Amino acid sequence: MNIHEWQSKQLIQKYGGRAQSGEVAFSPERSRDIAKKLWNQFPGCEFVVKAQVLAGGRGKGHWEHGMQGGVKLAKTPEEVYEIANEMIGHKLITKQTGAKGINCNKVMVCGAVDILKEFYLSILLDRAMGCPVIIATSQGGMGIEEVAQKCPECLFKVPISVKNGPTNEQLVKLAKDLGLEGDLVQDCVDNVKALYQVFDKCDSTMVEINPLGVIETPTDEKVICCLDAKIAFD
């Protein structure tokens, strides 16, 4: 059982992680109102509209009536309305849904940010090692099976002492192994600790962040941020 992206992100934020949870909208008009209000705060910003569906391959999918993408860029609140109008109440077809598609009745409206780096990061129980593991790659936005098959050099698998860890030294090395320098190293450490707390304290079978991003803030600071999130339960 998976929860939606915006709910996963809110849970991450609850445990001190940085995530772009945006605001959920149950109508196209509400989607526009969210965008309009955000222009009170960051005037002239752009928007991303993300269909909230329980299925994978959302961003790459296409709608039954022809629109391309479950994640779309919008320049104005009216463009946000137009996009949400083709998502809410309609069927999204992804690789994982097959031709049957999946109904969408809500979207997330987000501010558009400069994304500098995309990582993959997941926490799950590893059968072989008999403990939780952190799996991460510097090649976010890809099938994790493809990375292991075609690019095993950028994949990292970190065993975690179930409630005797993860240790700070493991997280610093992972962050540095992902190519992070400067303040982003500690930022990454802090965010991965929060993700583990979500995994542990919420009895999740998998916390998957694809992508875990390095983004720029509106005043150009570089920060770690969950840009998609999938949390699974039993």
Added chain:
Amino acid sequence: MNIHEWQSKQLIQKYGGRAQSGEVAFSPERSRDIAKKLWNQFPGCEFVVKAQVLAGGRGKGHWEHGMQGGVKLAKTPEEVYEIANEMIGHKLITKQTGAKGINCNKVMVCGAVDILKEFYLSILLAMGCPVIIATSQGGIEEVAQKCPECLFKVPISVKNGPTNEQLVKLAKDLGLEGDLVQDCVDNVKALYQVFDKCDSTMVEINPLGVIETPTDEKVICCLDAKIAF
């Protein structure tokens, strides 16, 4: 009678102007909630907390208990709480208030943005017709009053409103180039509709800014606003 900065900006927005009206808060707790919610949209952003008081010289002013400034940068929602807590329910002393100061009962919280240019622009009604005054200089409203020669002044045919040629020339005279010229033209046309359709004696934008959006586009934006009736 003047309306507050954030109300002035909301009125400008209603007529299609770009303005950082932020969100008003009447308690430090609400201020913090506003900030926390904004981190859902622009994670990691910084915040500006602006005392909403009907008095000038806020930025240089100081509060009784030591805090410097009516306009303050906050890095987190908790700094937003702390700053707002020193503003709301307290007295701000600026050169315009005198020692008697002015009570603050509200702040505006807005996202911190990179400001690339600050202009002064005002639309005023005195005994003749509307006039648009502006200068390319950045405490600039007193510079306007004691050095009026530093101002562009553009008379407006009340029957025909500002012409497009006047505003393009004004924007270019203020040093704007490229797409910012038309953006400025569009925003000043909105400020005129507020001035006209709301029977205002003054719409004062100090500063009218060039700011960067979160994805680094440059846009014209009202960063302060004072509207009189």
